[PDB]
Amino acid sequence: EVRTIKVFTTVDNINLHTQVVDMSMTYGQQFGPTYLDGADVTKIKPHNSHEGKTFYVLPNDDTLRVEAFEYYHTTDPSFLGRYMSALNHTKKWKYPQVNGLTSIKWADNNCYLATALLTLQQIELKFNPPALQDAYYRARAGEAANFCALILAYCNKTVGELGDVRETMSYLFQHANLDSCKRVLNVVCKTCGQQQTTLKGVEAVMYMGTLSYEQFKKGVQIPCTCGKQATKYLVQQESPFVMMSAPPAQYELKHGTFTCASEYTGNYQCGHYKHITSKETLYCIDGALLTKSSEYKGPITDVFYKENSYTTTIKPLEHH
Numbered sequence: 641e642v643r644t645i646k647v648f649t650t651v652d653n654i655n656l657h658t659q660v661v662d663m664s665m666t667y668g669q670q671f672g673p674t675y676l677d678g679a680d681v682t683k684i685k686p687h688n689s690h691e692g693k694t695f696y697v698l699p700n701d702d703t704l705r706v707e708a709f710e711y712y713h714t715t716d717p718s719f720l721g722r723y724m725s726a727l728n729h730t731k732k733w734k735y736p737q738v739n740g741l742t743s744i745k746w747a748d749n750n751c752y753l754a755t756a757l758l759t760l761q762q763i764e765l766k767f768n769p770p771a772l773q774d775a776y777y778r779a780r781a782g783e784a785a786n787f788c789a790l791i792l793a794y795c796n797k798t799v800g801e802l803g804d805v806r807e808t809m810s811y812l813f814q815h816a817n818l819d820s821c822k823r824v825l826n827v828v829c830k831t832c833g834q835q836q837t838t839l840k841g842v843e844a845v846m847y848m849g850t851l852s853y854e855q856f857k858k859g860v861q862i863p864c865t866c867g868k869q870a871t872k873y874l875v876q877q878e879s880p881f882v883m884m885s886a887p888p889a890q891y892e893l894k895h896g897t898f899t900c901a902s903e904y905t906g907n908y909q910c911g912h913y914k915h916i917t918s919k920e921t922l923y924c925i926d927g928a929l930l931t932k933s934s935e936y937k938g939p940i941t942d943v944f945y946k947e948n949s950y951t952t953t954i955k956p957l958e959h960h
């Protein structure tokens with residue numbers, strides 16, 4: 641009289657927990673919010689075809705809470721639901737291989753995600769959460785739906801929202817092992833003298849204000865804390881890449897002088913990202929579309945450079 645089937649529940653798709661579900665009640669009535677491959681099945685009853693399948697549930701007991709933290713590195717109770725909500729969409733996107741890199745076909749305003757995804761495959765970055773490590777590798781094999789859904793969930797962004805590549809990279813870098821990265825800056829005020837700062841982690845690899853790594857080495861003009869104009873320059877850099885960003889402006893990209901870059905067309909409220917990469921020549925990846933040219937000048941907002949160890953030769957005459 642009581643009909644049942646056996647399913648597995650999980651929060652990480654690795655640790656599977658056998659469950660016996662009553663076929664007269666919905667999954668929601670028994671588990672709470674329940675997902676089958678991203679699809680919200682909270683309000684449907686178990687079907688005979690569901691036997692043996694794996695369902696995601698929210699981490700609502702001590703065992704699941706530990707498993708979710710160990711896999712995702714966040715205790716945010718909303719995280720799994722936001723991941724599943726995004727995955728229901730990203731599993732329908734297409735992930736073509738374009739010039740040896742996994743891209744995303746245009747959909748749901750995902751151009752900024754495609755540009756970030758392409759960049760991540762070209763810089764040396766190790767993710768700390770197993771969820772991101774595993775999904776990054778699957779994305780490299782062309783199965784990028786989980787990686788894209790995780791990026792959205794870690795960024796607190798939903799499918800369909802417009803986005804910013806620099807912002808997206810900054811949030812992902814929070815989840816990368818960058819604690820060997822180091823940046824030493826000097827701000828030289830003609831009155832106050834020299835003021836040196838050491839940055840670590842995400843702050844050691846990102847700079848907002850110029851696209852040019854060379855210009856950052858030579859010095860950029862900024863207001864000193866006293867209100868006068870000062871000069872800031874890079875003293876020492878220890879990292880495998882650096883990201884230089886600025887609001888989009890016409891910028892010449894020379895083959896072999898950079899790793900990749902973000903082109904931004906349109907305006908600040910309604911823009912389009914494309915990805916420029918330097919290989920044997922210059923390539924532009926626009927979703928599934930590929931173009932090439934020997935030279936490039938256009939509206940750039942991020943440039944990524946290779947690095948290992950840099951020490952300035954600048955040695956100011958000033959004081960302090």
Ligand SMILES: [Zn+2]
Pocket residue numbers: 829830831832833864865866867868870
């Ligand atoms: Zn000053």
